[PDB]
Amino acid sequence: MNTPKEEFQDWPIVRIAAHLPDLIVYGHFSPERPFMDYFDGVLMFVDISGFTAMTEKFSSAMYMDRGAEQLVEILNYHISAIVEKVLIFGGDILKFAGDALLALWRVERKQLKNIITVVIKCSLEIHGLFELDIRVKIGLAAGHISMLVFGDETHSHFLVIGQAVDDVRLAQNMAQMNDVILSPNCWQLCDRSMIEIESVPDQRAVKVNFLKPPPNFNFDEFFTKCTTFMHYYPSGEHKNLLRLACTLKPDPELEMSLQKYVMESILKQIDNKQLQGYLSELRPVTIVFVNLMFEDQDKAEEIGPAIQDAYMHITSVLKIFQGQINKVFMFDKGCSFLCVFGFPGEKVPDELTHALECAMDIFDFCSQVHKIQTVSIGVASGIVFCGIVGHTVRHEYTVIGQKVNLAARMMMYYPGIVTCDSVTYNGSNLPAYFFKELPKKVMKGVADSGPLYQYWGRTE
Amino acid sequence: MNTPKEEFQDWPIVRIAAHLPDLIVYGHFSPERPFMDYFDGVLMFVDISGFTAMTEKFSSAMYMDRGAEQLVEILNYHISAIVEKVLIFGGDILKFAGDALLALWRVERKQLKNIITVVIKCSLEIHGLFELDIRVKIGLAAGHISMLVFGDETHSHFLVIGQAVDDVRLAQNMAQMNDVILSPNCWQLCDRSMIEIESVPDQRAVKVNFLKPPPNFNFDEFFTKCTTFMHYYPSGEHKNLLRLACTLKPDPELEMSLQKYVMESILKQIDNKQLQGYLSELRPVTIVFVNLMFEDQDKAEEIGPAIQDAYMHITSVLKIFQGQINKVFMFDKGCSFLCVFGFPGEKVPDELTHALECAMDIFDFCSQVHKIQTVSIGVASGIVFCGIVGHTVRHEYTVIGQKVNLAARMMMYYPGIVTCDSVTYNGSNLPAYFFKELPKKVMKGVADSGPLYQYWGRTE
Amino acid sequence: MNTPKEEFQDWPIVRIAAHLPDLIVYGHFSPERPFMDYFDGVLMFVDISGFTAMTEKFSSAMYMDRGAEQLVEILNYHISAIVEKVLIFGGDILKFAGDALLALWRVERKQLKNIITVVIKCSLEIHGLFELDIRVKIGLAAGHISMLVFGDETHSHFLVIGQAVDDVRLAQNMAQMNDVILSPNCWQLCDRSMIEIESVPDQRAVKVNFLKPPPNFNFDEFFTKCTTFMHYYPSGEHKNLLRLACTLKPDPELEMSLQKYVMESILKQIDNKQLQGYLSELRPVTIVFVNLMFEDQDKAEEIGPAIQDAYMHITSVLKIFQGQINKVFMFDKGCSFLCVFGFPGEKVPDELTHALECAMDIFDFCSQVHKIQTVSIGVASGIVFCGIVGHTVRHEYTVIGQKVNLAARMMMYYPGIVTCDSVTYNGSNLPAYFFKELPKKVMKGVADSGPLYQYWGRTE
Numbered sequence A, B, C: 001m002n003t004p005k006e007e008f009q010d011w012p013i014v015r016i017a018a019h020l021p022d023l024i025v026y027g028h029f030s031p032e033r034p035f036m037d038y039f040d041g042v043l044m045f046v047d048i049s050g051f052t053a054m055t056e057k058f059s060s061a062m063y064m065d066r067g068a069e070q071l072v073e074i075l076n077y078h079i080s081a082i083v084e085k086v087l088i089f090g091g092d093i094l095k096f097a098g099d100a101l102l103a104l105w106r107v108e109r110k111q112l113k114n115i116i117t118v119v120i121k122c123s124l125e126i127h128g129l130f131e132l133d134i135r136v137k138i139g140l141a142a143g144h145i146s147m148l149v150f151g152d153e154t155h156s157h158f159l160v161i162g163q164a165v166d167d168v169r170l171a172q173n174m175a176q177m178n179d180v181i182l183s184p185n186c187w188q189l190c191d192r193s194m195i196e197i198e199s200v201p202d203q204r205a206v207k208v209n210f211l212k213p214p215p216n217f218n219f220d221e222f223f224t225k226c227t228t229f230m231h232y233y234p235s236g237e238h239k240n241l242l243r244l245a246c247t248l249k250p251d252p253e254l255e256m257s258l259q260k261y262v263m264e265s266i267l268k269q270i271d272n273k274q275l276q277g278y279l280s281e282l283r284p285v286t287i288v289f290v291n292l293m294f295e296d297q298d299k300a301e302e303i304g305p306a307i308q309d310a311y312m313h314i315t316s317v318l319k320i321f322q323g324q325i326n327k328v329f330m331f332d333k334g335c336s337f338l339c340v341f342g343f344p345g346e347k348v349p350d351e352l353t354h355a356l357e358c359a360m361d362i363f364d365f366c367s368q369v370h371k372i373q374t375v376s377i378g379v380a381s382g383i384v385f386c387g388i389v390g391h392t393v394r395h396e397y398t399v400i401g402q403k404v405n406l407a408a409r410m411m412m413y414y415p416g417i418v419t420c421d422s423v424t425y426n427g428s429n430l431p432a433y434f435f436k437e438l439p440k441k442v443m444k445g446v447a448d449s450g451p452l453y454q455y456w457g458r459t460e
């Protein structure tokens, strides 16, 4: 009797699971919204620099209208290699945002010290692959982490929250190219007998210099000990897989739960109802970047109800005005929603007007949600890259472009108002007195923004 | 000199062959129609219960318009596992019908006894995989089998015929969930020293209790002996394949012959001229289920010419009225054609009227074909699942739905007339006196049919 | 720590590289046009006979509108096997033209003798696979070879040039079915102690009879020695691949260079923006076969500037009149461009008129380019097969059909004018006095051409 090969089965549930972390795939938590949970872990925030500028260059004539295809290929080639290292070192990729990603090693509190060594080693190997003018910067944090899941009956979103989350962002932002930086708490919890560091001027964070293993040390054996504490590390018969999620079996209840996190146009491609090619594009869109600031953004039980309330109105007005939520994350200050008008299927003239009216509506509503202290929204319009970024086994739809960065910076440097760029202002069919021309601010990461405006709105 | 890997070649002929049994793929018989051949074998009829009800539930809002995708995935996950067991035990899957399938072990007469043991073991392992409220029922028969091939210059269809065929259906219909039932002849021919059974009240068929191997028995060694008699069992260099048909090589004469069995829209997908996704759908259709009854339905030489004659008119009127033959099989009483109006590409309003006029035409013509004793047709309209069901190496296009079952039951419980359901009646643009409202019958497998009607037709 | 499988990555650059030889993929030469380089090598020209006639037959009703699909499958099955042998013996496939291909073993001059033995062995094994009424004929040449690359800022084309190139064509044209013929120079350079031959009446070329290895000879060991001189032979960790090009890594500069050789509609399919199926078709087109003759067609430095100049005008007028360059090669006499009107996306009525006006324009312009001695153009219209031919790892878009051959023969047998077939003449919307009915010539490879015409043009 034969024992024939089992071909890998690439069921729709497995293709769905590529777009999600283990934290959600194996989370089995309540469908109630907001849902909050609490755990401990180590966070790694990896940023490739230089892709934002490459994006502008891939629009030029030299790429012969295959700029989107060439961009996603070279990006995925590099990002895939980082993803592989994260996964092989036992991490869970939570989200991709442009040319960056955020990874988590969730463990019980007593194992944080040893897992931090693992993550530092991972980071140093990652820094290694990049010895294309592209550099990698890495921020690490460790400690208490909260998770929020918010959404409605057909869509779900998650976020991680708390000091470790704020810390990992602060750390990555101080990093110079090729630095691995540790949060203050990460450095207080780490195995100091092995991690040689250098102080960072005016900061309590530190920079990793090198690993200094002791005499009998064997990283393989140590790693193996750490894998006792890693619930989903592929092992035994599945030690040849990058993710346990590759073995997920059809299960309609689980699939119903997981698909709510994934955009409809992505589900269409998963379902072989649309060609793979059409989601990689360089196309004119409007970014609407919404920031909600709270009194205490480390306190999920306070902020979760507010984010949910805001989300319920945001999703509804986006639907009216033809926009979509591409990504949500916690900033240094606030919960941000990266919203996009014009992407795969949704398109118009008056797209600009709609973006601005939608922004004002979100501003007016969210400003009155309990516990939201300040709302800020930046609106910018131009050619941006849209596509699936990452590795075959772990990837997400994301946007990359100078206008994405400009909207984010606008929302940060002009808090409490709705701002737009010049493309949006000039292009909109709105009268000029609905706007106010603003003082020009020098903005981290922005060469020349062009004139900027506040959308003051219809009256006053 | 290198000896590089040969990648599996997934030629169009191999993709075609997935839709057909070895009986046709390696049959090399005459292109004349009708063509009849005669052999012996063991039949297995496997029915999954519960999918029909799942179908109705996958239309509900909870599935978020991915009901067809979710249904076919969970169905294929389960059906694939049954297919694998059948193939590994040496069987040939003849056809899929909804959530059921029919498999054949063709052997010389002296080997029936030993092959029945093989098939019983297979069935018990199948019953095993299912220890989703889904149960499996299995009917087994053995003896003389006839095959009919009928068709025209561009389409071919096959059927198996005779007492063993009637028996395998009777056996499966007495089975309670999880039973394996043997036909009377199967039980008379089997190795009684090993097969422990229980009598079935008012029946000569029996139910399998267990296998009772004797002292020196080794199933592997026994199976190996049986494989001497199995012409296409994958072996040697190809022992890692589920089917020898996976090695089929391009051959335009053979492909021309085999494609005649496969629907045009399936050939389009095989040819990479249409996306895979679009054939899985939950869509409103009309089923027209035609039953032809004969004086002796076990006698191919009598019934073959009649089926061919009926087929020639059916295919032509279906073409006029935009219908298609989805499946043909022998019932307990008769040769049935499962015909569908509205599926992938063919669609209209007046679809209902056309279904009814086509049905009446088929009824009038077939009632006058020599040797057809009675024609019965059931017409029902609703949402039905349409898609490719089975395993990657062996699968077919089929339909599943409560309206498929209702049409089949109508045709059986109201013989000699054309009947329709209420959806079809109310929806048709035909005057009401073309119909007659019928007494309601309690019908095996039908909760509440709604009012039913006879299509009496234009005059009388 | 796991070491998971790396799945083959089928990046867009690798899919591009399938359409090109190693000569271009790893050539890294100047973007200047014309670019010429010089080397030595052995050429093999392999022709399958019989596919041209199969093409006409795959249009017949028996193929049930899947003639293109069936044709490309059976062709690729056979051609793939020839490709594999060429690659495993260390050759580089330069181009496919219909059911023929041309392969190169580039080596330093001192190694020509031993490499010729390798190529003869390859050819004898190829002749072996074909012991479908299809025969294979092989011509071999060896010596100095020039390469020309010509083109503009977005398209590139290459050619090989010189006596060895002329010789390999002459040799293949004398071959009877199943012959392997050596050019005079090939026979003068080969290892005569091992290659037994037969003279060819009125020719200095010879025919291979057999290999006569000496006593201690071991082909494997000898082959291994020869692989020292083969720059890209897959080896070590990559000894299981048919081409090193299968390992190519994303590199936007390299991809920008390589894509210029590949048709836009092919790049669309590579990019998963169009279904694979649609490029295999049997469709009515017009072939415009342009031949440029030079005083000395073995002298790249003379002819390269002329071909470039001609190309610059040809590409521009083709664009106006909706045609495309499908292939370019050196004939016995001249550089020929195989141009096609009507293929995937480009289509009209007046297609015929346009083909003829485009032809006349090319004729008038190219006749005045310095060093072009004579221009000849044949225009023929009918159903031709268009599709990707070859192996998964090495294939190209090409056309096959009796009308392709007829246009080529017209251009050769009626030099110095523009000729057309009867389909083109009758179909064109041009007045009859724009033409001249020509004497009928018996033409190598042409049963009955129908009446032929000179397109005399508007005036005289």
Ligand SMILES: Nc1ncnc2c1ncn2[C@@H]1O[C@@H]2COP(=O)(O)O[C@H]2[C@H]1O
Binding pocket: A096, A097, A098, A099, A173, A327, A338, A398, A399, A400, A401, A404, A405, A408, A409, A445
């Ligand atoms: N896809 C994306 N998702 C989120 N942010 C992005 C994306 N592309 C660019 N950016 C932002 O650009 C911002 C600039 O400031 P930061 O680097 O602190 O934070 C950065 C990101 O939030």
Ligand SMILES: Nc1ncnc2c1ncn2[C@@H]1O[C@@H]2COP(=O)(O)O[C@H]2[C@H]1O
Binding pocket: A191, A192, A193, A194, A195, A196, A197, A198, A199, A200
């Ligand atoms: N693993 C360690 N344990 C104790 N001290 C350390 C360790 N690694 C680095 N140091 C540092 O030795 C450093 C010398 O450089 P700094 O001035 O940056 O700050 C000093 C300490 O922070």
Ligand SMILES: Nc1ncnc2c1ncn2[C@@H]1O[C@@H]2COP(=O)(O)O[C@H]2[C@H]1O
Binding pocket: B096, B097, B098, B099, B173, B327, B338, B398, B399, B400, B401, B404, B405, B408, B409, B445
């Ligand atoms: N795809 C299908 N093909 C044939 N029959 C079907 C299908 N789906 C449901 N049924 C029928 O529903 C019928 C009800 O009665 P039986 O179970 O005896 O026979 C059953 C099948 O013939």
Ligand SMILES: Nc1ncnc2c1ncn2[C@@H]1O[C@@H]2COP(=O)(O)O[C@H]2[C@H]1O
Binding pocket: B191, B192, B193, B194, B195, B196, B197, B198, B199, B200
């Ligand atoms: N393999 C066998 N050989 C002989 N008798 C059998 C065998 N298996 C079961 N029996 C049964 O022993 C059974 C006791 O249960 P029943 O009353 O169902 O019917 C009786 C016989 O049919």
Ligand SMILES: Nc1ncnc2c1ncn2[C@@H]1O[C@@H]2COP(=O)(O)O[C@H]2[C@H]1O
Binding pocket: C096, C097, C098, C099, C173, C327, C338, C398, C399, C400, C401, C404, C405, C408, C409, C445
């Ligand atoms: N795709 C093709 N490319 C080039 N030539 C072709 C093709 N199909 C048929 N032919 C030609 O038919 C010609 C007839 O003469 P030759 O055999 O000398 O050269 C042959 C080829 O050039």
Ligand SMILES: Nc1ncnc2c1ncn2[C@@H]1O[C@@H]2COP(=O)(O)O[C@H]2[C@H]1O
Binding pocket: C191, C192, C193, C194, C195, C196, C197, C198, C199, C200
């Ligand atoms: N390898 C070889 N070395 C020398 N002579 C050869 C060799 N192979 C064949 N011959 C031939 O012996 C041949 C006898 O046949 P021909 O008349 O064709 O021409 C003669 C020579 O060309």
